[PDB]
Amino acid sequence: RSGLRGQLLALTIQHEKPDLEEQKTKLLQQEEDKKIQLAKLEESLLETLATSQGNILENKDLIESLNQTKASSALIQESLKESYKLQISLDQERDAYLPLAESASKMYFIISDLSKINNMYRFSLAAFLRLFQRALQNKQDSENTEQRIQSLISSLQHMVYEYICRCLFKADQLMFALHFVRGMHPELFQEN
């Protein structure tokens, strides 16, 4: 569940605007490379402490250790400023898609359990992501984006329902409809 949520969230971010996607890619890659290089620069601290354990005040190894620790402190403060300069800059441009991806992760696990009454009701995931591509590629909806999110979940439920009832048997569509409604909105039938 939690993996597929992030997968569809990344697809929606890449299909909303490419600039936010390229930014969230480049910032994360630079943060990872900076973390690896920071571990590499702090990996000489054992050498600067006990590389020979003698004449540490005499040789210039302690002089080069000052330059290395200066580089380490510079990269540490730079990474603090970078992790501050990416958090809210990615949260407000990434959190504008997750109420789509939440119910889109609900629908796949709804239609997964359709095989357990009739065989050959076995559904893939590559065609499902092809459908999730078709939801964008046919939409062309120019509104408020917060007015676009309910539009896209609405025009995705239609395509899911039509794609599954292409396959089904004629005495099974009411089954599929009621189980689908129980899957999407579990609050309108309360308890017991």
Partner: protein
């Protein structure tokens, strides 16, 4: 299956051995660091005084302060892991 019971025991013994050896290596390196830093500080706390005494009866202070400018963060970083690994390798078998 009892084959899984014996696989369990063998991988327990293997992982416990590898982690005991790596924790003893980490405490050895941290102990060597805590020895060398204290020895160099005890050497530098009297050398300029001995030179001043020889000048009183009758050039490493800058690089010592430059080393201390990194050591104020470095020794403060490398301090705590001795007691940390010391309290960690009493909680290795259940892990």
């Amino acid at each position: 299956t009892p084959s899984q019971y014996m696989t369990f025991l063998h991988v327990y013994s293997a992982i416990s051995s590898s982690k005991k050896k790596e924790l003893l290596k980490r405490q050895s390196h941290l102990q060597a660091g805590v020895s060398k830093l204290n020895e160099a500080k005890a050497l530098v706390d009297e050398l300029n005084r001995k030179a001043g005494e020889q000048s009183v009866l009758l050039e490493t202070i800058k690089a010592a302060e430059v080393l201390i400018n990194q050591l104020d963060r470095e020794h403060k970083r490398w301090n705590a892991q001795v007691v940390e690994i010391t309290e960690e390798l009493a909680t290795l078998p259940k892990r």
